[PDB]
Amino acid sequence: QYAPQTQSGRTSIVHLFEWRWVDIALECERYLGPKGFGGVQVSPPNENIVVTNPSRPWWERYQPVSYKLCTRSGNENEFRDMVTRCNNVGVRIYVDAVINHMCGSGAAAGTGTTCGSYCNPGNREFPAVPYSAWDFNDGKCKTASGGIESYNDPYQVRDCQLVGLLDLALEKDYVRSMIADYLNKLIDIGVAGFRIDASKHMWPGDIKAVLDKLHNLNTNWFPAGSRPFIFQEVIDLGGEAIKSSEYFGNGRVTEFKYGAKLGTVVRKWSGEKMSYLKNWGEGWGFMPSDRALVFVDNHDNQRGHGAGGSSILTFWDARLYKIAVGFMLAHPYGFTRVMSSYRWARNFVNGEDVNDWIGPPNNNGVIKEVTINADTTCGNDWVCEHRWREIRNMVWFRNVVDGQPFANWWDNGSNQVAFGRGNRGFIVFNNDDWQLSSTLQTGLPGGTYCDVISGDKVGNSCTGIKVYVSSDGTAQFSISNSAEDPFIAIHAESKL
Ligand SMILES: OC[C@H]1O[C@H](O[C@H]2[C@H](O)[C@@H](O)[C@@H](O[C@H]3[C@H](O)[C@@H](O)[C@@H](O)O[C@@H]3CO)O[C@@H]2CO)[C@H](O)[C@@H](O)[C@@H]1O
Ligand SMILES: OC[C@H]1O[C@H](O[C@H]2[C@H](O)[C@@H](O)[C@@H](O[C@H]3[C@H](O)[C@@H](O)[C@H](O)O[C@@H]3CO)O[C@@H]2CO)[C@H](O)[C@@H](O)[C@@H]1O
Ligand SMILES: OC[C@H]1O[C@H](O[C@H]2[C@H](O)[C@@H](O)[C@H](O)O[C@@H]2CO)[C@H](O)[C@@H](O)[C@@H]1O
Ligand SMILES: OC[C@H]1O[C@@H](O)[C@H](O)[C@@H](O)[C@@H]1O
Ligand SMILES: [Ca+2]
Ligand SMILES: [Cl-]
Ligand SMILES: [Cl-]
Numbered sequence: 001q002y003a004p005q006t007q008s009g010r011t012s013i014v015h016l017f018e019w020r021w022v023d024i025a026l027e028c029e030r031y032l033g034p035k036g037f038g039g040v041q042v043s044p045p046n047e048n049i050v051v052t053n054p055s056r057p058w059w060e061r062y063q064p065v066s067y068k069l070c071t072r073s074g075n076e077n078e079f080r081d082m083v084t085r086c087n088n089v090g091v092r093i094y095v096d097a098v099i100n101h102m103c104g105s106g107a108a109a110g111t112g113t114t115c116g117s118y119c120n121p122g123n124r125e126f127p128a129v130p131y132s133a134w135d136f137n138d139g140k141c142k143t144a145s146g147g148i149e150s151y152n153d154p155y156q157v158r159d160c161q162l163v164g165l166l167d168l169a170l171e172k173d174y175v176r177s178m179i180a181d182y183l184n185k186l187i188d189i190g191v192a193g194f195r196i197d198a199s200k201h202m203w204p205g206d207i208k209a210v211l212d213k214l215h216n217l218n219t220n221w222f223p224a225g226s227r228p229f230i231f232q233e234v235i236d237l238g239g240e241a242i243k244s245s246e247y248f249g250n251g252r253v254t255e256f257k258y259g260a261k262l263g264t265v266v267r268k269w270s271g272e273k274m275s276y277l278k279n280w281g282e283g284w285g286f287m288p289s290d291r292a293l294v295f296v297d298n299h300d301n302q303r304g305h306g307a308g309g310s311s312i313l314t315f316w317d318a319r320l321y322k323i324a325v326g327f328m329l330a331h332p333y334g335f336t337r338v339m340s341s342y343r344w345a346r347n348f349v350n351g352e353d354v355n356d357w358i359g360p361p362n363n364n365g366v367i368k369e370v371t372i373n374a375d376t377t378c379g380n381d382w383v384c385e386h387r388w389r390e391i392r393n394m395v396w397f398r399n400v401v402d403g404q405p406f407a408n409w410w411d412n413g414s415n416q417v418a419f420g421r422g423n424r425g426f427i428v429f430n431n432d433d434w435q436l437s438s439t440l441q442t443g444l445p446g447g448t449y450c451d452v453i454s455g456d457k458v459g460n461s462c463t464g465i466k467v468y469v470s471s472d473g474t475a476q477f478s479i480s481n482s483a484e485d486p487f488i489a490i491h492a493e494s495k496l
Contacts, residue, residue, distance in 0.1 A: 437478045
């Protein structure tokens with residue numbers, strides 16, 4: 001596991017989705033380390049099938065063909081180099097572990113794979129592992145199609161093929177052990193933990209049996225006796241047969257209710273208002289905070305027919321997105337993951353993006369480097385949300401207020417709200433269609449604080465808005481509904 005195993009006082013990770021290992025290594029050194037980020041979720045580092053139709057989609061990386069560390073992100077040398085260099089500046093690496101399945105059961109036999117390993121999907125042959133037909137669930141699945149036909153039946157969901165993907169027999173010790181050997185190699189290299197991909201589609205007990213095999217973390221960088229951080233991808237928005245809570249014994253779980261509900265609120269859809277967020281967290285029926293991995297969007301649902309559908313806020317909706325991410329990073333609930341994306345050409349037919357397959361920025365299938373511009377944005381159509389001032393400064397906010405309680409909530413009964421974290425930070429939102437102008441109790445020591453949304457503290461100056469806090473802890477906040485960023489945030493370390 002439940003402990004993130006970030007360096008003490010670093011409280012977020014970022015998904016550097018489809019980034020190459022060498023770019024992540026550099027990003028750790030030049031940015032993530034200095035700016036107090038806890039760690040990086042990386043794309044699946046194990047060999048996957050090449051998909052040519054369409055041309056190299058992002059989702060080809062969720063069709064394993066071996067556990068060789070050999071992908072469009074880089075080779076094993078490059079992967080090791082990244083883990084080392086990131087750990088050495090206090091930034092952890094968490095691996096997206098794709099362990100429920102191998103590649104599509106309909107895929108062709110051959111060496112069209114990211115490391116050139118052979119496989120024969122039709123005959124269930126993966127000699128680079130090795131797996132054979134004995135190692136898959138084909139006989140155990142009881143549906144006529146061999147696929148998942150109803151999510152109301154937990155057995156189907158776990159024992160049958162998810163969109164045609166060959167389903168590993170996770171009951172078998174052979175298979176559990178093959179997966180563990182992969183994960184343990186990663187741990188010994190210096191990885192801090194794992195996203196368990198497609199956890200809904202495995203039995204909690206099978207996952208447990210894999211996790212029980214795992215090494216303690218590498219003592220070059222971690223305290224003796226450290227267990228790998230585990231967060232399991234389970235989409236459970238409530239009202240379905242399989243529940244998040246089934247997986248609490250194994251580690252944390254993705255709380256997909258979080259972004260779905262928050263997006264709907266901040267969009268002001270379905271009658272929802274920001275003032276309703278006063279009891280955000282368990283009060284909204286979420287899992288326990290100490291079980292939750294939270295996020296506004298992830299790599300799936302930012303394309304807009306995942307968990308949350310069109311309510312999910314993304315970099316495409318930058319203004320409201322920064323508000324949602326700001327609220328998340330200020331609020332004590334959950335352990336926070338920040339998304340970092342690339343741009344693609346969206347093309348909505350009947351409200352589905354038929355271009356939602358498009359893979360990372362590339363020249364002829366070779367992933368582009370991340371270039372850094374003078375203003376600290378990225379080129380090559382990497383969006384780099386994690387470098388937006390409004391987000392990076394809120395990542396720092398969360399560090400600064402770590403451990404401080406939810407306090408001093410205020411709202412106007414509509415869509416203006418505020419709250420603080422003990423005596424170490426305070427944040428104020430206007431999401432109404434009129435002016436915010438109020439004097440609020442911040443819980444903070446009197447003084448002058450730089451707003452870290454509009455600017456930064458530089459020496460003994462602020463580059464943006466300044467907040468003068470009275471002796472009694474109150475301050476005026478004045479925020480127009482036409483402000484570019486209609487929220488203000490201050491904390492102990494932005495005080496002059
Ligand atoms: O040939 C099998 C199958 O391949 C394609 O399905 C892909 C999905 O379109 C795509 O959403 C993706 O799904 C995964 C997620 O990123 C991960 O979080 C987790 O939620 O599980 C999914 C699997 O690990 O990847 C699949 C597989 O590539 C294609 O669209 C299908 O038509 C085809 O049947
Ligand atoms: O606690 C379990 C439920 O938590 C969440 O419910 C939200 C509602 O979605 C949200 O509308 C809001 O409810 C307010 C309601 O709209 C209004 O008519 C009433 O007067 O005040 C309510 C409280 O502000 O807040 C609740 C949480 O308090 C979650 O969305 C839901 O699925 C859970 O069942
Ligand atoms: O720190 C870099 C810049 O971050 C923000 O710029 C964002 C902007 O907020 C967002 O709406 C847009 O979609 O992306 C840009 C970055 O490309 C700050 O607003 C800028 O002042 C910073 O320079
Ligand atoms: O320990 C988890 C177990 O749960 C059972 O209900 C399933 O039938 C097994 O396949 C699985 O191994
Ligand atoms: Ca399964
Ligand atoms: Cl189980
Ligand atoms: Cl996820």
